[PDB]
Short mmCIF file of C-alpha atoms in Angstrom, two decimals:
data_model
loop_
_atom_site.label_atom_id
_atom_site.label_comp_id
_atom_site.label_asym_id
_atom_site.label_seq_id
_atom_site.Cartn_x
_atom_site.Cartn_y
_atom_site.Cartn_z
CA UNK A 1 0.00 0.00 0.00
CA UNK A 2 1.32 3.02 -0.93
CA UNK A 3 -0.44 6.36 0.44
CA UNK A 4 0.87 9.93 -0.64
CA UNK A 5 -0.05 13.47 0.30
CA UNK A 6 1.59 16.52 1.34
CA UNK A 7 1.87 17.82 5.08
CA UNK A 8 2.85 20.69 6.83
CA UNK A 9 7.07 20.90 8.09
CA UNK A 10 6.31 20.74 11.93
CA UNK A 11 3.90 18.13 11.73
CA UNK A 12 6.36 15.30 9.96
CA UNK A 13 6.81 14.10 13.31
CA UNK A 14 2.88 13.28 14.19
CA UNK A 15 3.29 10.34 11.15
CA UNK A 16 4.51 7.59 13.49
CA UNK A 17 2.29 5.34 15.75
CA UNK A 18 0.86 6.38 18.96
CA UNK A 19 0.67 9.82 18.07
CA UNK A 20 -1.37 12.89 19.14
CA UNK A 21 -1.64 15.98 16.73
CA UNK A 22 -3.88 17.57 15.04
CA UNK A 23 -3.36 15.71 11.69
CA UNK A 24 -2.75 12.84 13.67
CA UNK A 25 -6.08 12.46 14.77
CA UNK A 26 -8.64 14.24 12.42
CA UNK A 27 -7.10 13.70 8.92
CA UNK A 28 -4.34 9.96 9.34
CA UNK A 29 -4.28 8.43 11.76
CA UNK A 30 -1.26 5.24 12.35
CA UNK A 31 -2.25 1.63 13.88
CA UNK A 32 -0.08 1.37 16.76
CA UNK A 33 1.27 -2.05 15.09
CA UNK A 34 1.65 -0.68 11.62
CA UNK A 35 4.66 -2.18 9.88
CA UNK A 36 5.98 -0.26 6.42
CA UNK A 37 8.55 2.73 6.27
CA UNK A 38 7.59 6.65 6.06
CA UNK A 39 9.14 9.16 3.32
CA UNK A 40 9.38 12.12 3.72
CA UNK A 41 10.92 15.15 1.66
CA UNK A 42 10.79 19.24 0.83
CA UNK A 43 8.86 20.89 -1.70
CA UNK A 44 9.34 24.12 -1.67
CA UNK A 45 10.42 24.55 -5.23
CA UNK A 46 7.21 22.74 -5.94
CA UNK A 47 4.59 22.71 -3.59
CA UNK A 48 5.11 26.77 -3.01
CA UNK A 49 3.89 29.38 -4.45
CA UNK A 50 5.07 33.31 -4.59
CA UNK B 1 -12.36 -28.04 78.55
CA UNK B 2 -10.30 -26.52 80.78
CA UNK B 3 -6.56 -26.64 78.85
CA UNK B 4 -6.01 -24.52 76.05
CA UNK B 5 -3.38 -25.12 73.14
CA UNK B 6 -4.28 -28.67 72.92
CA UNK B 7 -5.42 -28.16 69.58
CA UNK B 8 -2.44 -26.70 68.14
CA UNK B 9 -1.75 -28.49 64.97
CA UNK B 10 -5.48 -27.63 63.54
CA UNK B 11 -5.13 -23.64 64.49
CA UNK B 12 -1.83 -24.22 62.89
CA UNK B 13 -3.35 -25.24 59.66
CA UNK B 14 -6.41 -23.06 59.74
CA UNK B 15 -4.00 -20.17 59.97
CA UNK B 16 -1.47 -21.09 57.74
CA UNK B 17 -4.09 -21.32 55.07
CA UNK B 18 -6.11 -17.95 56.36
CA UNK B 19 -2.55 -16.05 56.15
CA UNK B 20 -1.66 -17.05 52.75
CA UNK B 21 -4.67 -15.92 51.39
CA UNK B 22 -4.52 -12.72 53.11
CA UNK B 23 -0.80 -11.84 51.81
CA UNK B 24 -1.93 -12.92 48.24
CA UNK B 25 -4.32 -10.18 48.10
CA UNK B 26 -1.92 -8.15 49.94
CA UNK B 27 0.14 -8.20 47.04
CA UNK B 28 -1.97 -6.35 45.06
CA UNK B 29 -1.15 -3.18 46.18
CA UNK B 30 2.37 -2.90 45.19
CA UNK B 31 4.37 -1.09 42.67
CA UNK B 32 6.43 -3.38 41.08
CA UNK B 33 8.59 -0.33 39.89
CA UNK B 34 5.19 0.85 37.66
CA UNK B 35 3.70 4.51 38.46
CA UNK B 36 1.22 3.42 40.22
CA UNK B 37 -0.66 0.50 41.46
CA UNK B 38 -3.91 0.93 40.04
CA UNK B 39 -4.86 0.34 36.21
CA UNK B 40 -7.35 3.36 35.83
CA UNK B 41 -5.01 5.96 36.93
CA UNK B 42 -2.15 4.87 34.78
CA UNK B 43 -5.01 4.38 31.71
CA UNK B 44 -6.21 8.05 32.10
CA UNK B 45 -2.81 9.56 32.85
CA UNK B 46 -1.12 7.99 30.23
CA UNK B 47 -1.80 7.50 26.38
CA UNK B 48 -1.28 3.64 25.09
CA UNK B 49 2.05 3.57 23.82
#
């Protein structure tokens, strides 16, 4: 399974199991066994408009 | 009837048996190096992980 968005900098951190946030909770949310890895990685040249 | 202690290896068991019991759920309220020794208050305290 592959699932792909785009997030906030500060939040990165709420993508892990047994997390509280406010992404964490009302948009993804983790199972506290979930197996798999996490990428993550800047857009700014991208995602970011003037 | 009139001597006591007579009896002793009965009382013996009776209380052997009764103190047992009563340091088994003695044991209940320790730590064992946990926060606390009660369930709820380390459930509402704490989140799972």
């Amino acid at each position: 399974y592959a699932d792909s968005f785009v997030i906030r900098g500060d939040e990165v951190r709420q993508i892990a199991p047994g997390q509280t946030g406010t992404i964490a909770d009302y948009n993804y949310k983790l199972p506290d066994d979930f197996t798999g890895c996490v990428i993550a990685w800047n857009s700014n040249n991208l995602d970011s408009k003037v | 009837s009139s001597t006591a202690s007579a009896l002793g290896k009965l009382q013996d068991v009776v209380n052997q048996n009764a103190q047992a019991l009563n340091t088994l759920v003695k044991q209940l309220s320790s730590n064992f190096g946990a926060i606390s020794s009660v369930l709820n208050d380390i459930l509402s305290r704490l989140d799972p992980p």
